Write a protein that binds this ligand. Structure first.
Ligand SMILES: Nc1ncnc2c1ncn2[C@@H]1O[C@H](COP(=O)(O)OP(=O)(O)OP(=O)(O)O)[C@@H](O)[C@H]1O
Ligand SMILES: [Mg+2]
Length: 280
């Protein structure tokens, strides 16, 4: 097997790896690396080319194409360089120093994020999702772990990552889809309906929900109850959980967490919701 991207020797000569491990999947690892010429921090995502006996190089090439297509979009992480060795393709990505937006969804940071902050972050996410949709790209993995922040103090800007699930609209629901963290799946996935831009809008409702209440809207005692809640769209909107959340935000969330994907507004409409029309 011949290599397509720059040799590993070039990587070791231009970049420095640190002990800082930013993320570890089963066939991917994200390490912090630093340029030797500029000392600028980057994120090096190592992707194994073989997964479960299957040669997945073509799948990696797809994720690179999508990163390239959205380079002009500030809300999508930028791809700086690509390297390759025997078993890995290495993506050098713009470093997001703020980390996952999932941190803001936990009760221990609820006291530093206000409604005004959530409005800005949701507006930025919608901007990036609007771009992807305009290019017939559906992320299909818009969970808080795949949406990062440029900085945390002060709260920075949105950077969407992880395009391994990206597809053209209308693709067929494959096993890879209906096998993610159950609580972030859309009802149409469990039904095996085809892929639609509306699937990403469902996840945007979860993001907004978790940022404002700091709880998951669909997780249950076990996976079975999680699936039941998703298909039944059983979401807690009680006064206890929403005593401090505005009605406009409640309306925004409820318009996106609807079973029928047809009834969900598009990314362009969401940007016109009264809740986001805040004269910052
Ligand atoms: N550019 C980056 N800057 C900072 N942290 C990053 C960056 N890219 C990824 N991470 C972190 O690494 C973690 C894993 O990265 P990523 O989500 O892109 O791949 P993965 O989900 O683990 O694997 P796969 O794409 O094969 O499903 C992310 O949750 C995020 O916290
Ligand atoms: Mg991920």
């Amino acid at each position: 097997e011949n290599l397509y991207f720059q040799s590993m020797e070039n990587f070791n000569n231009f970049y420095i790896l640190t002990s800082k491990e930013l993320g570890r999947g089963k066939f991917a690892v994200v390490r912090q690396c630093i340029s030797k010429s500029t000392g600028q921090e980057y994120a090096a995502k190592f992707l194994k080319k073989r997964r479960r006996g299957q040669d997945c190089r073509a799948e990696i090439l797809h994720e690179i194409a999508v990163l390239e297509l959205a380079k002009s979009c500030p809300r999508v992480i930028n791809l700086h360089e690509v390297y390759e060795n025997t078993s890995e393709i290495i993506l050098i990505l713009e470093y997001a120093a703020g980390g996952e937006i999932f941190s803001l969804c936990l009760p221990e940071l609820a006291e530093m994020v206000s409604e005004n902050d959530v409005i800005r972050l949701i507006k930025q996410i919608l901007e990036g999702v609007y771009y992807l949709h305009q290019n017939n790209i559906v992320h299909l993995d818009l969970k808080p772990q795949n949406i990062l922040l440029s900085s945390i103090y002060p709260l920075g800007d949105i950077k969407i990552v992880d395009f391994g699930m990206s597809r053209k609209i209308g693709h067929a629901c494959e096993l890879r889809e209906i096998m993610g963290t159950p609580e972030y799946l859309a009802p149409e996935i469990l039904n095996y309906d085809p892929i639609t831009t509306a699937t990403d809008m469902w996840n945007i409702g979860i993001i907004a929900y978790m940022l404002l209440t700091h709880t998951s809207p669909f997780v249950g005692e076990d996976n079975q109850e999680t699936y039941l809640n998703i298909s039944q769209v059983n979401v807690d909107y009680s006064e206890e959980t929403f005593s401090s959340v505005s009605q406009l935000a409640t309306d925004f969330i409820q318009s996106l967490l609807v079973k029928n994907p047809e009834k969900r507004p598009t990314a362009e409409i969401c940007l016109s919701h009264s809740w986001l029309q805040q004269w910052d």
